[PDB]
Structure 1
């Protein structure tokens, strides 16, 4: 697709509302899905979240486990009376009683030039945080402050790299991945339920280029 079209696409895709719940129990766990118990009430209907993830990642959970959710939906189901289920990818971490707010340093380069990013721009209260949560916070920031996906923007490529301080290769997201041009494919990059120990993330390295 063309630059202008990819921008409009991603701008709309990442404008999608994010779901954040710190304490919920898994009602059902299957090979590659987790379904929460009632989260709350949205538009008069009882709200539930279904998380799709690689079987390898799902192996980490069992029915009854207490978990936290931070994810973006790609579909909704209203076929059941007084009920609504949002479908998402990963975004699941073990329940954490006490919040531990921590800022994650960010290094940003736009078209080769380094740009300062405030100390408190990206943060999380989790000791085990998903790459998805960080990505969502990063893109919201970039869209609001650095013209990411904006109309009239010349950007065409970019990446968010998690520069961890361990022996693992650096995990990253492609900021201009468009898949099949819909939420189902674009958000599918979160299916691995990738997460990090907060003390292992040294900082984030972001590149955006035209």
Structure 2
């Protein structure tokens, strides 16, 4: 009865996955490090014992050390009866007051043609941030503004490209899911804990396609 039914279901899974409140805490202590998990304390914020378990890919926790202060910006993929938030990656070194006021500019292209230059569509206050934080915020902006995950929008393909000084153009599929994808499935990509220093950030490009 249709040839676009699948992309609609894919968009539905993405719209649901990203319509969420992130785990956002700054200047938190790394209580313990395992081969693939960060165990971070956020008890001071909660006023009761509470931690965050950030699961990552190999050789990421080795970049950190116990009792180092870090910032957390991760999307929860599951909830349990315990006072612990479960996220993938989203961990960066906290190196200052975390009150950066840097300008974020980007280009929005649809079907290969520039539509507008986005000025501060999103805001990031930390000097070092994860692509997860940038990705979440930009998708939310796109969801709210261009309805990119609405079944009635013409967008069925899209990429987010982040330009970093040194020809490093990170590129991510904006329609990265199947009709069966859970938040865990969709967020697993963030286990690489990919991080960018705002000072190395040049701009970003959003490529949306209708065919």
8 Å contact kept, 1:106–1:205: yes
TM-score (norm 1): 0.89
**Match status 1:166 vs 2:156:** no
Name stretches of at least 5 consecutive residues in structure 1 with no aligned partner: none
**Cα RMSD for the two superposed structures:** 1.8
Which of 53, 67, 70 is the aligned partner of 2:70? 67
Distance in 2 separating the partners of 1:154 and 1:199: 35
Alignment of 1:35-50 (within 5 A): 35-39=39-43, 40-41=45-46, 46-50=49-53
Deviation at 1:22, TM superposition (A): 1.0
Q: Determine the C-alpha separation between the residues in 1 that align with 2:116 and 2:49.
A: 43
More strand by share: 1
Distance in structure 1 (CA, Å) of the matches to 2:113 and 2:147: 15
| Greater helix share, structure number | 2
Tell me how far apart the structure 1 counterparts of residues 66 and 152 of structure 2 sit (CA, whole Å): 48
Q: Which whole-Å CA distance do the structure 1 matches of 2:24 and 2:194 have between them?
A: 17
| Residue correspondence of structure 1 range 83-94 to structure 2 within 5 A | 83-94=82-93
The equivalent of 1:147 in structure 2 is 147
Find the aligned partners of 1:22 and 1:87 in 2 and give their Cα distance: 16
Q: 1:68-107 alignment to 2 at 5 Å?
A: 68-78=71-81, 83-98=82-97, 99-107=99-107
Q: Deviations over 1:153-200 (max 9, x none)?
A: 222111111111214x32121101116511111001111111111111
| Unaligned stretches of 5+ residues in structure 2 | none
Cα distance, 1:84–1:159 mapped onto 2, change above 3 Å:
same
- Ranges of 4+ aligned residues in structure 1 off by more than 4 Å: none
Aligned to 2:129: 129
